[PDB]
Structure formats: structure tokens, C-alpha cells
Amino acid sequence: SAVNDPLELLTNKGTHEPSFLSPIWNPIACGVAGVGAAIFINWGFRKPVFSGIQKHIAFGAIGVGAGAYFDQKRNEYLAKRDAVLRHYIELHPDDFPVKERKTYGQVLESWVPVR
Amino acid sequence: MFNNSSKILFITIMIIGTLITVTSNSWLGAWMGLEINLLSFIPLLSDNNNLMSTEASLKYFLTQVLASTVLLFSSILLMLKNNMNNEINESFTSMIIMSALLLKSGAAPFHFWFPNMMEGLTWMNALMLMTWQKIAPLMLISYLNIKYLLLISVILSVIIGAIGGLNQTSLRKLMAFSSINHLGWMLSSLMISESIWLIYFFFYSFLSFVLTFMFNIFKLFHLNQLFSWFVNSKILKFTLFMNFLSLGGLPPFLGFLPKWLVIQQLTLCNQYFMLTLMMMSTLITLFFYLRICYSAFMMNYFENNWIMKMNMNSINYNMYMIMTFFSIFGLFLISLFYFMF
Amino acid sequence: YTDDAVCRFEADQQFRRDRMVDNEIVNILRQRFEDCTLYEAPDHMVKCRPLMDQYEKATENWFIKYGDLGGYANAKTAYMKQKHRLIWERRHGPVGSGMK
Amino acid sequence: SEYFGGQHLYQKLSMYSKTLFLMHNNSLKIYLLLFVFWILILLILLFL
Amino acid sequence: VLGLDKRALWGALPLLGFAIGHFLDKKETERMTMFRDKSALYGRPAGSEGKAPSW
Amino acid sequence: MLKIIFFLLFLIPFCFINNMYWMVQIMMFFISFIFLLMNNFMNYWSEISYFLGCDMLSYGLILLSLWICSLMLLASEMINKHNNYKNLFLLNIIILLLLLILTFSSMSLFMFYLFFESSLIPTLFLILGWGYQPERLQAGLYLLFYTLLVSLPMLIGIFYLMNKIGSMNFYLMNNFMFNYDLLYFCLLCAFLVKMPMFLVHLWLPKAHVEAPVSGSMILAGIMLKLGGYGMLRVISFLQLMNLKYSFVWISISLVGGVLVSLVCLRQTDLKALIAYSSVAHMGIVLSGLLTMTYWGLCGSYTLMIAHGLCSSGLFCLANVSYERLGSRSMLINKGLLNFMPSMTLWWFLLSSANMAAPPTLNLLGEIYLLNSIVSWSWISMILLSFLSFFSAAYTLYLYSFSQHGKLFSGVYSFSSGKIREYLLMLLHWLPLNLLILKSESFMLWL
Amino acid sequence: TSLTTEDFANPSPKNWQSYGFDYKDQVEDRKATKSTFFVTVTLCLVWGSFYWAYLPDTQFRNWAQREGFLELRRRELAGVDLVSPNYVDPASITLPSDEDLGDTEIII
Amino acid sequence: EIPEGYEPKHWEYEKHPISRFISRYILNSDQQNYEKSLHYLYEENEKA
Amino acid sequence: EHFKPTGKSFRTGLFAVVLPIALYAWALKAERDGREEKYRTGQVAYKDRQFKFI
């Protein structure tokens, strides 16, 4: 629409579809991190890197669990953040007034003649 | 917490002392917590096997006693004129409080005692001093809102902290000058926010927590010892030293993320000139870090040959290797962190 | 609008496609004068002269439109050159006559 | 080009690192005295 | 003539990365479907449209 | 685009398995072939994937790296011959390549910077790890500290652009034109260093002379282009400011090119001479780039591709000679036509390309920068004549002096050229010619 | 040793000369040479250059030339200048009248 | 000439049979890259 | 190691690069400014503009 209402801009509509890697990147990233961290420990102790896979599974499992938990909390923090902005906009409609959208017909800015 | 049950106590009472300061709703309450913290650190710091250690126990005591003394002096004076824990418009009486706190933390103009007491500390002692003891002082400075005094300390901190460090060879003394520089970044981050400072401090402690262990686990105290240090896989030694680069804040590693968020906020607040002096001065800090990496990046050395073997503690090394892994690959986990938004 | 990018992106690509068509409509006209000079020599001056007149006019119109923008020329820049050109025309008359 | 470049800059930076070393090679009293001087100036400005 | 041996059998792992890499971005294009057959330069005529969308 | 990235990532473990040095390049060459099939790009960004796209500009530079980074493995067979931490060496290149691919394939300015410098550290390990001469330290710092000193201030200039544009994406930036004088210096003095400009080139002769053969390839091959590529993206919204200070840069680079060519004639080291030849041509690239005209932009993109392949090529030959004669000085290296006559052919073709000889892709780009510069000002014809004249004066001296005369006397017996070396040289030069046929693609990025 | 006139005339298939790809295992050295040639040449240069030549018209340069002819014929017949000097028609534009400008710098 | 109301598939727009094959099974149609770019610029503009 | 700003070196370096750069950078600025002034003033009709295609 021709209007610039800041509250409209913030408000979601559900049109956006989050990417495929979005709901899995933090779990999978931590899971790989846990395993890789376990790989150092054996290497640091000059043990066969895949010896004692128990520790790999634990670190991988612990990584996934922690990743999912913190990812769950992340969205609440983001959801709350926009909620704050939307509420603050509503309280001060004067400081965020609706502005009209100019088009290039009604403006004359400079250009840079390279020559 | 290394030798006896008594050392366990002093560590805890240090935690209680720091907490009392940062949870206190008045200057007087805050000052008490500093006194609690003072005597929790000295016994941990004093050991009579070393002629040097007792000297360290002294310089710290005289400095901290003076700091708390002058700190209490101004706080009484502050509420003698305002009758509130807070000053409506900052003035000289609030500056005096700032001066004490900076000396309490060894900022640039009053840092002299801080490296000069690092000769006679064990590595585990230096970590407690470098990281934890800087919590209470710096956290109270967030209350005071003087700009030029705080601004001056930053400019001198990064400069003195860097240039002084070039000339050292003692790693304990080198890290002190390195820590003074990171202190400069905090105070810069402290005039803009705290959440950055809380984030930045946590990362700073993380990296120092790592580098201290590597020296502590292998008891290295001088640059020469790095070259003489024996490791089975020169690849392994090469990778352990790649933590210094993170401490230098290079972006491929985790240690830059802290520096990065401090610039995305300082720049947002139009403090462009400060960043020039700071970031430029960090290069000199990055320099002597590379002087340490001379013992790792080149990877075939002339070394003494009466050692074939590495003798190391497991649990410290076990925790050190985990911490090192993130210190090199910790960047891709910025996605997870939700404390910057 | 000054805030939407898809509509700007739509026009920038359209401007670029039209630029190619207009770049080489000049090229075709050059090839005509190119070919007449080879198909009409030795008496080619009389016959290529009209073709070159078509060519030189096209170049100027080409240079009035896309000229002096350099690389990064885009729909916005080309249109804004036109707005400034027209303002100068009504005030100082056609270019080449100088200002008043 | 390297007079204003590196080799001189290092020769200057190292020269200052020498000077800061001597400034750190003093008794503990001097540094505290420096602090007290700073306090006294702030107190004097307070009366004004 | 290739002069390849059993060691190249490990090559399947990098080829595994190729297919996984191909799959994701292909999955990404299926997330790009809000100007699909709607832009002014390729948008379908209003009415009596093809059943299957182009690309 | 992710097809490339995940291919490289899963090739990382090949560094760890033993006797996999040669199986790596094939995976590195094969991916170039796969990447070579997916050319359907345009001026605007294409094949979006979460933040990774590619236009015609980024494509050629990416494909150049894959080719060059693949030749690094061929050139540095000595690392395999002496098992000199080859596994670590391989991991350095695979990491380094990934940083490059992301750097060019990044769609947002902040990312470009994020991987811009990050590629440096893998290069820095390369110099110290595998360099012979003791000076790799004193040349290791120059590469690191010239770059960091001018890249850190660039980071501020990047963030200051969010608070105005609100984003980093390149297309959205072009809609703005900024007027602040310092901002201009915080996004070009950082790239003018890495080009390099004549007065701030002091790191280039040190890094190239001391770095190993492979490090010489990538330093001369892709690092000098990241400065050039960066400029092509950020003069779009510095057009107005570019007009007030361009004449400073054009004069310095043009006069800088001439003066360096004389410096080339007074060199006596093969590695030094080739490195100083890089500054000479890079002066023309930068000069035409700042002219901002359609020709100067397309030409600059072309020459960066061509020059990288050539200068990378010429570093092969210096390594071949150095490997046997043991010394890189011109006095030692004489009359090599009488030891390795088959080699001398490749010396000529790569040398000839460096002096803008036809039908190479190098001459196509150089014709264009020359056009833009002349159009910029007819006074530029003076040195632009000198620079093109002297740009052959040292090339002949490089080729003729090292190949023609009577053989050295003290040299001890050494092996003759091997098939690996010849195959390496062909892959450097042969594309540099055939690319002229399809300059359609690697020219019109605008 | 003291090799003979036939040890030089009866080449021993025992020692071997390396093609620069390996110096220890003879079959390995030939094996790397063969595979490296195949990809670098038989695929990257032969198949690559072939595929390049038949690449579809992706820059819309061949397409333009078709427009440059059709577009030229239509407008050479239509009594319009062969290249329009206006990005949009001047009459469609709405100039800001002089009082609006207020001394704004105008450039050509 | 294009029939009155016929929509060609993108590969129909080229002459040589090999070029038809590449554009049909080896490369993304020009429409696809054009219309993905529109989406991405739309979302990116919403950031700012 | 054996360099010193001895005046002879400065005098050598001064005329060597700095003035050729300065004098010639001045010439470029001068010539373009004169040429630019005509264009801004509107002196040159689009018929007569050189390097139309550059």
C-alpha cells in the first residue's frame, strides 16, 4: 500500500516461510560441535580418535539437547522483542507518524556525470 | 582451590564478597563488599616458598587499601552534599569515586602496580586477579556517568597496555600488559551499555581462562621455555597456540566476536574516533602475541633433547582441550547466542 | 516508490535490456554505412553520405540518453539526467548555446 | 617509503617500550603518590 | 586409462557432499514461491493460467 | 551454489587419510569442471542460498581461484616428496579455498569483509610453515600488518553504512550516494593497499620473494584481486566522492607504474622482478577502475583474471629454476635454454603474455583500461606510453637474461624438467588464450 | 658398477624414471599421472570448452541482435527517431517549476 | 513466429539442439533466477 | 640499515618521485577542471562531445 505505517511494518502475517536449515541448524551445529570436541580429547591424549565412542555420543547428545533448549528460548526473546517495539509504537503515535511514500516523479536529486 | 580445605573457603568468600558489592543498593554497602573481597584474595596470594610471592601480597594490599579508603572518602563526601546515593548532575565529587575504582582495577593511569605485582603469582592466582577481581570495580563504574575521565582511561589503557607489553619476555608480566588492553575495551564498552560489557567480559575471561591453563598445565613462565617445550605432534602444538590469535581478535576464530559486538555498538553510538585509537592500538597488542606464535607457526625447531615425553595433568588438560576447541571453532555458534539482539 | 526495491529492480533490468537494443541499433546503422562504403566505391561518398547522416543522429540520441553515465548506469541515474537536462533546456535553451 | 613505513616505526615503538620499562621500575610509593596528587587536584577544584 | 584405484572409492564422500549441497539449494528454490509467475516481466496473464507453474 | 561449498567441506577429511595427496587435486579439479557447467549468470545476483549468490563478476573470480588453487597442489609436489607436514599443508589450502569461495560468493558487504581478511590467516600459516629463507618472519608480519592496519578501519566504515542504508546487500547500497570525505578513505584506502598502490606496496616484494611457490601463486593470484574485486563493488555508491580525489590515485598509480618498471630493470632476483611486475600492471588496473567508465570497469575485471593466471604462471617457472640451481638470483640463472630447452618455450609464452602480447586475454583487458584512461584525460598518454614501453623492457630482460646467455660455471648436476612441470605450465597459459574465444562471459559483468 | 656395452643396450626394466608425481612407488607415479591428465585435459579443457561453445544464450546478446533488427525495422517504418533521446517521454514528465528549485544546483 | 496465445517453455527459445538440451536439464531457467531475485530483494528491503 | 635522512637522500627522493607525482597530478587536475567547466556551463553541444562511447 501507499502508506508507511510503522506498526504495519512490524506486524507479522505468516507469509514468510523459515528456511529448511533454520529449525535444525542449531541442533545439528551443536551436535557436530560436541562430537568434534570429543575428537580433540582423544587426539590430545594420543588416543585413537574414534576410541571410546561413549564420550562422542554424550558430547553429541549433550550438544543437541543444549542447542534445542537455547534455540527454544531464542525465539521467545525475539518474539518478546518485537512485542516491545509494537507496544512502544502504539503508545507514541506522534513520534512515529504515518508518512507518505514519495516516488521518483516528485523528487529531484543529483546525479554523478562521470565524463 | 589447589592445596588444602582452607583454600576452598577463601575462593567462596571471594564470590560472596564480589556479590555483595554488585548487589548493594548504596555506596556504603558496596564498599563493605570490597573489604570482604580484599582478605579473601590475600591468603590465596601469599605463599612463603617464594620470596617474590610475599612481595606480591604487599603491593596488592597497599594499593587496594588505599583504593577502598579513598573510595569510602568520596562516597561519604558524595552524600554529604546530595544526601542521596546518586548525584543528579555529575561533578568533581563523582570524579574522585571514579579515580579510586580505576586504581582498584588498574586502569591505565593507575595500572603501575598491576604488572609490577605479577612477577610473583602462580598462574592460577593471575587468573583470579585478571578476571574475577575486575568484576566488582568495573561493575560499579557503570553507575557513574563521567565521560572525559572514563574516556581518558580508555585511550591511555590501550596505548600503555600495548606498548609496554612489547618489551616483556615473562609471560606472566606479558599477560598483565595484555590484560590492561582488554580492560581498555571494557571501559569503552562501559560508557555505551553493559550488556555488551557483560558479553565482552565473559569472552575475555574465557580466552584468559584458556591461555592460563596452557601455561599452568605445562608450567611455562618465559618465552624461551615455549621453544624448549616438547610436544609429540607439532601439529598439536601448532593448534594450541592458535588461541593467541583469538585473543588477538582475528575474525576466523571465536575471539573476534567479542571485539566485533563492541564495534557494532560503539559505531552505532557515533564514537568513531575512539575506535580508531583503540582498534589501531590493538595491532601492537596483536604483535607480541605473534612473538609467542614464533614457537608454533614455524614448526621445526632446535630443541633440547633430554625429553621425549609429555607429563601433563588429565582433568585440567581435559577441560583445556574442550575450551580450546571452541576457541577456534566457536564462531559458527553465534547463531545460537541470543544475548546481542 | 523511493522505498520499494522490487519495482526498482524491475525497471533497472528493463533499462538494461533496452540499452542493449539501443546499443546495437547503432551498431546496425554503422554496418549499413560500413557496407555501402564497400559496395559503392570508388563513388561511395555520394551514397554513404545519407547513411552516415542516419548514423550520426542515432549516436547523439544514444549519447543524450545513455551517455556520460559510465558503468553502474541504472534506471534511476538515466531518468535523473533527463530531469536535469530538461530543466536546463527551458532555462538556458538547448545545450551548446551556454548559459544566460 | 619504509622510513615512514615499518622499520622506523618499530625502531620508535621499541624505543618507547624501553621508556615505559623504566617508568615501571620504581618504588610502589611513587605510583601511589601520583594517585594522591590526582586526588588533591580534584579536591582543590571542588572548593572552587 | 583413468589410472584410478580403490583409494578413489573415498571420493564418494565428497560426491555425497555434492548431492546434499544440491538438495538444500533445490529445497531453497521451493521456498521461493511468492513472485513465482507473478512478476510484471514474466507474470502469467490474468485468467486461464497453466496448471503447473513454470520453474 | 551450496553444491560447491559442501563439496569442499566433505573433502576436508581427505587431508587426514594418508596417501591421499594426489586424490585431492582430482577432487579439486573435478569440482572446477562441475562449477564450469553452471554458468548461467547475469549482472544481477543469481542462485540464492541463504546468503550466497553469484553474478558474472563473482563467477569468473571464483572460477579463477578454483583453477589456481588446484594448480597450487601440482606446483607444490615437493611437499609431498618430503612428507613435510603434507596433511596440514592440504588442510591449509582447502580451508583457504573455502574462504575465497565465500568471499566472492557473499552477497552482503559485511560478509565480503568477514571472509576478505579471514583468508589471510591461512595464507600467513602458509608462508611461515613452508618457506625456506629466514626472512619469512620479517615478510610474514608485513603481509599481516599492512592488511590488518588498513582493514580494521574499514570495519568501521562498513558499520556506519548500516545506520544509513539499513542493510549490507550490494544491490540496496547502490541506491545511495554518500558525501562524507572520510568514509571514502575508509573503503578505498583499505583496498588501495591490497592492490597494491605504488607507495604502499612495500609488503608485496617481501611477501612474494619469501613465500613458498604455492604461497606465491595465491598471493599473486587471488590476494591482489580481493582488493580489486572489493573496489568494483564499493565505487558504485562512492561515485560523487570519487570525482574529487580520483586524480590523486590515478597520478600515483600511473607514475607509480613507470617508476616501478625502472625498478624492475635494476632488480637481480627472479622472484623480486616478477613481484614488482605485479605492481606495474596492477597500477593500470586500479587506474582504469577509478576512471569508472564502462570500458575501464569491464577491462579491469578482465585484466585481473588474465594477470593472475600469468603472474601465477611466472612464479611456477622461477620455482622450477630455483629448485635446481638452488639460487633465485639472475646471475646464477643464465642460459637455461641450454640446460632445459623444452622449458624455455613456456618461459616465453608466459613472459609474452605479461607484456600484453596477443592473442592472450591479457591484451584484451589492457586495450580497454588504456581506452578509459585516455578518455579520462589526454595528458595520460605520456606515461601510459612509457609504462607500456617499459612493461616490455623488463619482461625481455627477465626472459632473455635468464634463458639466452652462456651457462653458469659453478652449477652442479641436476635433474631435467619433469612431465608434472610441463603440465603445470600448460594449464596456466593455455586457458589464458582460449578464454579470448568466450570473453563474452568473463568481460560483460556490467 | 662397471656396466657393459649391453647393459646400456638392453634396458633393465628394474629401475624407473619418475614423471614428477611420485619418487617411491612406480605404479603410483604412473597412476597419478594418468588420472591427473584425464580430469585436467579430457574434461576441463576438451569437454569444458565444447560445452562452453554450445552454452545457451544467457547474456541476451544474441537475443538483442534480433531486437536490433526487428526494433529498427518497426521504428524506421514508424517515423520515429531510430534511438529515442528520452528515457521517458518529456511531456509525461512533470518538471518542478523554477520557484520550487530555489537555487538547487543543476548539472548536465 | 509465436502462435497467437502460446507460452513457450524457456528451452524453446533457442536454436541448436545441444543448447536446447543444456538449458532444459542442466541450467535454471532465466525466469527462475529473475523471480528468485525479486523475492530476495523484497525480503532484504524489508530488513532495512 | 645504512639509510639516513641526510638531505642528499631527501633531495634525491624529493625530485625522484614526489615532484613528478605532484607536478603531474597537478596537470591532470588542471586539464580536467578546464574541460569539466565547459561541460557544466553547457558549452559543448552533444554533437561535439568527444569520446561518446569512451
Residues of chain G contacting E, Cβ within 8 Å: 30-35, 38
F402 residue type, one letter: S
φ, ψ (nearest 5 deg) of residue H16? -65, 135
CA distance F315 to F221: 10
- The CA-CA-CA angle for residues F55, F433, F390, to 5°, reads 100
Chain F contacts of I17, Cβ < 8 Å?
255, 259
> Cβ–Cβ of B164/D24 closer than 8 Å?
yes
CA distance F174 to F107: 13
* Counts of helices then strands in chain E (DSSP H, E): 1, 0
> Cβ–Cβ of D5/F202 closer than 8 Å?
yes
Q: Which three cell numbers stand for residue F150?
A: 588498513
DSSP notation for A19-49? -TTHHHHHHHHHHHHHHHHHHHHHHHTT--T
Q: Which three cell numbers stand for residue F326?
A: 638452488
Burial category of B77 from C-beta neighbours within 10 Å (exposed 0-12, middle 13-18, buried 19 and up): middle
Q: Taking CA atoms, what residue in G is nearest to I42?
A: G108
Quick one: how far is CA F42 from the chain centroid?
23
> Cβ–Cβ of B341/A77 closer than 8 Å?
yes
The minimal CB distance from F5 to the residues E16, E21, E32 is found for E21
| 3-class state of residue A100 by DSSP | strand
F257 residue type, one letter: G
Domain ranges of chain B: 1-341
Neighbouring-strand partners of residue A4: A99
The minimal CB distance from H32 to the residues E29, E34, E50 is found for E29
- The answer for residues whose C-beta is within 8 angstroms of residue F411's C-beta and 6 or more apart is F325, F332
A30 residue type, one letter: C
How far is residue B194 from each of residues B186, B187, F163, measured CA to CA in Å?
Answer: 9, 10, 21
> Cβ–Cβ of F25/G33 closer than 8 Å?
no
Which run of H or E residues covers position A10?
helix A6-10
Please give the resolution of this entry in Å, rounded to 1 decimal: 3.3
With contact defined as beta carbons under 8 Å apart, do C40 and C49 qualify? no
CA distance F443 to F446: 8
Chain G contacts of I39, Cβ < 8 Å?
108
With contact defined as beta carbons under 8 Å apart, do B34 and B66 qualify? no
Any chains having at least 3 CB pairs less than 8 A from chain I are A, C, F, G
Indicate left, alpha or beta for B219 from its phi (over 0: left) and psi (-120 to 50: alpha). Answer: left
In chain C, the N- to C-terminal Cα span, in Å, equals: 35
With contact defined as beta carbons under 8 Å apart, do F70 and F25 qualify? yes
F331 residue type, one letter: L
Chain F contacts of C13, Cβ < 8 Å?
44
> Cβ–Cβ of A112/C77 closer than 8 Å?
yes
> Cβ–Cβ of G104/A111 closer than 8 Å?
no
CA distance F128 to F276: 22
Q: Which three cell numbers stand for residue F19?
A: 596417501
Furthest CA-CA distance within chain B: 70
Q: Taking CA atoms, what residue in C is nearest to F444?
A: C71
CA distance F4 to F15: 18
**Each residue of E30-43: b (16+ CB within 10 Å) or e?**
ebbeebbeebeebe
| 3-class state of residue E43 by DSSP | coil
CA distance C67 to C88: 17
CA distance H35 to E33: 8
> Cβ–Cβ of C5/H41 closer than 8 Å?
yes
CA distance H44 to B48: 65
Helices B195-218/B171-190 angle, 10° precision:
170
- The CA-CA-CA angle for residues C46, C50, C55, to 5°, reads 130
Quick one: how far is CA I18 from the chain centroid?
12
- The answer for residues whose C-beta is within 8 angstroms of residue F288's C-beta and 6 or more apart is F295, F296, F297, F299, F300, F303, F368, F369, F370, F372, F373
Asked whether I and E share 3 or more beta-carbon pairs under 8 angstroms, the answer is: no
| 3-class state of residue F47 by DSSP | strand
CA distance B190 to B196: 8
> Cβ–Cβ of E2/G38 closer than 8 Å?
yes
CA distance F37 to B94: 69
With contact defined as beta carbons under 8 Å apart, do B101 and B139 qualify? no
Helices B256-266/B195-218 angle, 10° precision:
160
Chain H contact present for G51, CB below 8 A: yes
- State the structure-solving technique: cryo-EM
With contact defined as beta carbons under 8 Å apart, do B138 and B190 qualify? yes
Q: Taking CA atoms, what residue in C is nearest to H44?
A: C5
The minimal CB distance from B338 to the residues A29, A33, A77 is found for A77
Q: How many CB atoms lie within 10 A of CB G45?
A: 17
CA distance B278 to B262: 11
Q: Taking CA atoms, what residue in E is nearest to A18?
A: E31
Neighbouring-strand partners of residue F106: F52
Q: Cell 607429563 appears where?
A: B311
Q: Which three cell numbers stand for residue B286?
A: 596483536
With contact defined as beta carbons under 8 Å apart, do B105 and D26 qualify? no
With contact defined as beta carbons under 8 Å apart, do F415 and G23 qualify? no
Burial category of D25 from C-beta neighbours within 10 Å (exposed 0-12, middle 13-18, buried 19 and up): exposed
In chain I, the N- to C-terminal Cα span, in Å, equals: 48
Which run of H or E residues covers position F53?
strand F52-54
CA distance F423 to F445: 31
Q: Taking CA atoms, what residue in F is nearest to H22?
A: F37
> Cβ–Cβ of A29/B325 closer than 8 Å?
no
Q: Cell 624407473 appears where?
A: G16
Quick one: how far is CA H23 from the chain centroid?
9
Which run of H or E residues covers position F54?
strand F52-54
DSSP notation for F345-395? HHHHHHHHHHTT-TTSHHHHHHHHHHHHHHHH-GGGHHHHHHHHHHHHHHH
CA distance B129 to B116: 13
Q: Which three cell numbers stand for residue F41?
A: 549468470
Q: Cell 589501531 appears where?
A: B280
| 3-class state of residue H9 by DSSP | coil
DSSP notation for D8-33? HHHHHHHHHHHHHHHHHSS-HHHHHH
The minimal CB distance from H48 to the residues F37, F44, F165 is found for F165
Chain F contact present for D10, CB below 8 A: no
Burial category of G79 from C-beta neighbours within 10 Å (exposed 0-12, middle 13-18, buried 19 and up): exposed
CA distance F49 to E24: 8
With contact defined as beta carbons under 8 Å apart, do F320 and F423 qualify? no
Residue among C64, C83, C90 with most chain A CBs within 10 A, to mutate:
C83
| 3-class state of residue F8 by DSSP | helix
CA distance F281 to F224: 11
Chain E contact present for H41, CB below 8 A: no
| 3-class state of residue F50 by DSSP | coil
| 3-class state of residue F205 by DSSP | helix
CA distance C22 to C12: 15
Q: How many CB atoms lie within 10 A of CB B219?
A: 10
CA distance B287 to B266: 24
Q: Which three cell numbers stand for residue F77?
A: 609436489
Chain I contact present for A80, CB below 8 A: no
> Cβ–Cβ of F199/D6 closer than 8 Å?
no
With contact defined as beta carbons under 8 Å apart, do B133 and B152 qualify? no
CA distance F394 to F262: 8
- The CA-CA-CA angle for residues F112, F115, F121, to 5°, reads 150
Chain A contact present for I37, CB below 8 A: no
With contact defined as beta carbons under 8 Å apart, do B105 and B134 qualify? yes
Chain F contacts of I29, Cβ < 8 Å?
247
Residues of chain B contacting F, Cβ within 8 Å: 234-235, 238, 245, 250-252, 263-264, 267-268, 272, 275-276, 279-280, 282-283, 286-287, 290, 294, 297-299
Burial category of F129 from C-beta neighbours within 10 Å (exposed 0-12, middle 13-18, buried 19 and up): buried
Chain G contact present for I42, CB below 8 A: yes
- The answer for residues whose C-beta is within 8 angstroms of residue B36's C-beta and 6 or more apart is B13, B16, B17, B20
Chain A contact present for G94, CB below 8 A: yes
Note if the bond before B137 is cis, omega within 30 degrees.
Answer: no
Gyration radius from chain D CA atoms: 18
Please give, one letter per residue, the 3-state secondary structure of chain B: CCCCHHHHHHHHHHHHHHHHHHCCCCHHHHHHHHHHHHHHHHHHHCCCCCHHHHHHHHHHHHHHHHHHHHHHHHHHHHHHHCCCCCCCCCCHHHHHHHHHHHHHHCCHHHCCHHHHCCCCCCHHHHHHHHCHHHHHHHHHHCCCCCCHHHHHHHHHHHHHHHHHHHCCCEHHHHHHHHHHHHHHHHHHHHCCCCHHHHHHHHHHHHHHHHHHHHHHHHCCCEHHHHHHCCCCCHHHHHHHCHHHHHHCCCCCCCCHHHHHHHHHHHCCCCCHHHHHHHHHHHHHHHHHHHHHHCCCCCCCCCCCCCCCCCCCCHHHHHHHHHHHHHHHHHHHHHHCCCCCC
Q: Which three cell numbers stand for residue F253?
A: 598509480
Least Cα separation, residue C5 to chain F (angstroms): 8
Q: Which three cell numbers stand for residue B254?
A: 571465536
CA distance F397 to F395: 5
Q: Cell 584410478 appears where?
A: E4
| 3-class state of residue F254 by DSSP | helix
DSSP notation for G23-85? SS-HHHHHHHHHHHHIIIIIIIIIIHHHHHHT----SSSHHHHHHHHHHHHHHHHTTS-SS-S
- The answer for residues whose C-beta is within 8 angstroms of residue B108's C-beta and 6 or more apart is B153, B154, B155, B156, B157, B159, B160, B161, B180, B184
Chain G contact present for I34, CB below 8 A: no
With contact defined as beta carbons under 8 Å apart, do B36 and B13 qualify? yes
CA distance E29 to C58: 43
With contact defined as beta carbons under 8 Å apart, do F86 and F15 qualify? no
Residue among E31, E36, E38 with most chain A CBs within 10 A, to mutate:
E31
How many CB pairs below 8 Å do chains G and I form together?
4
* CB hemisphere CA count around F183 (13 angstroms): 19
Least Cα separation, residue C75 to chain F (angstroms): 11
φ, ψ (nearest 5 deg) of residue A76? -60, -40
CA distance F303 to F310: 10
Gyration radius from chain B CA atoms: 20
Residue F385: closest CA among F369, F370, F365: F370
Strands F46-49 and F52-54, by their bridges, are: antiparallel
> Cβ–Cβ of G58/H30 closer than 8 Å?
yes
Q: Which three cell numbers stand for residue G84?
A: 529515442
With contact defined as beta carbons under 8 Å apart, do F78 and F428 qualify? no
The total number of residues written for chain F in this structure? 446
Q: Which three cell numbers stand for residue F184?
A: 571514502
Indicate left, alpha or beta for B83 from its phi (over 0: left) and psi (-120 to 50: alpha). Answer: left
DSSP notation for I1-54? ------SHHHHHHIIIIIHHHHHHHHHHHHHHHHHHHHHHHT-S-TTT-S-S--
Asked whether E and F share 3 or more beta-carbon pairs under 8 angstroms, the answer is: yes
Chain A contacts of E28, Cβ < 8 Å?
19-20
Q: Taking CA atoms, what residue in E is nearest to H39?
A: E35
* CB hemisphere CA count around A16 (13 angstroms): 12
CA distance F10 to E17: 6
Least Cα separation, residue I8 to chain F (angstroms): 20
CA distance A71 to A73: 5
